Symmetry: none
Subunit: 129 residues, 3 copies
Amino acid sequence: PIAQIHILEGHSDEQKETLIRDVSEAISRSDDATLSSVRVIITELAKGHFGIGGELASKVPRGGGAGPIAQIHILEGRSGEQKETLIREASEAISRSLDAPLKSVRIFITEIAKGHAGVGGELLSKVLR
Amino acid sequence: PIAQIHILEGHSDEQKETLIRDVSEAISRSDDATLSSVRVIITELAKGHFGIGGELASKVPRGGGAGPIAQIHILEGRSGEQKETLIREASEAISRSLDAPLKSVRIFITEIAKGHAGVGGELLSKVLR
Amino acid sequence: PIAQIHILEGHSDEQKETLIRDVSEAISRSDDATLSSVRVIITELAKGHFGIGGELASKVPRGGGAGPIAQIHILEGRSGEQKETLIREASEAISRSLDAPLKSVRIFITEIAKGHAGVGGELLSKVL
C-alpha cells in the first residue's frame, strides 16, 4: 500500500520519522500487507496553499479542522471492516506522531484493481500466482 | 470534498487566495456540500517538471497547453449531471482566478465510496448516523 | 518511484499490461532506479469525469485534448536533462502503449525529499 500524507509545515524531522514508522506499522497491521511493501510520502503544505471552506488554513485555526490529509492506495479485496480499521489505526498513528488532534485527521482510501497495479513492470495479478 | 490543484509557478499569493475561495464555493454549490467541508490543496509545478506531448512546458512557448490540472475527490452519490456542473464551474473558477485560459484547464473527478472516507479515525458513513 | 497514470476508459487489458511494463522500464532507465522499485497505478477515468476547458471529455470529439495524465513521484537528485528524458520517454511509452496521440499525453514530476519518503517504515535516506 501507498500512503500520501499531506501535513502542515513546521513539524520536526523527528516527528516525521515517527509518522513514517508508526503509520507504516499501522497500515501493515490493518491492510494485511508486509511492512516492507508499505510506502509513505510526506508532502508539506504551506499555509498559503491549504484551503478550508475557501479560507487559508492560517485564518481558520480554532475550528476549521486543518490537519493531516492522507490518501492510502490499497489493492482490492479487503472487507468494509478491514478498511475501517485501516482508516482508524492510520489516523491514530498520524495523530500521536504529529501531536495533532485526532478530529483534524482526514483519511480516504482508493482501491486499485490487481490489473491496474504494477510492480517491476508486471501486473500484481500475474506475479502473485 | 478535497481538491488537489496543480498550478504553474509564478502565481501571486492573492491569485492563490482567490483560487481557494472561488473554487471552494463552486465545489460547495455543485457537490451539495457544506462550505466548511471543502478542502483545497494547491501544488506548484516547475515548468521543467511538466510535460506536454513529451516536451517540457518550459521549452514550448506558453499557449502550448500547459495549464492547471485539478483532481477533485467527492463522495459517491452525485449524478452525472451534477458532476458535469462541478467540472464546468470549478474549471471556470480556476481559469478566472489564475487568469489562465479555460482551454488549458483540466479537471477530473475521483469518487470515494462510502466507508472509504475517514475523519478522526471514524468512517464518514458512521459518524453520519 | 511511483507512477499514477490516469487514462480514459476503453483500453484493453493487454494495452494496460504493456503500458505498465513499457512505462516502468522507461522510468527505471531514466530515473536510475531498480525495476523492482518502480510502482505503477492505473486509474481509469470515466469520460463523464474528465473535464477539458470545463467540458466533459465524453461531449468533445477525439483529439479535443482528453488524454493520459501521469504523475511520477521520484526522489530528489536528478538533473533537468534526466528529468526531461524521463518525461519524454515515459510520454512516448504511454502514447504507443495506449495508441493515444503523443500531444494529448501530460506527465508531471513530483520530487520527494529523502526524509519525506518512507519504505517499510524507514526513511529512504536510511535504506537507500
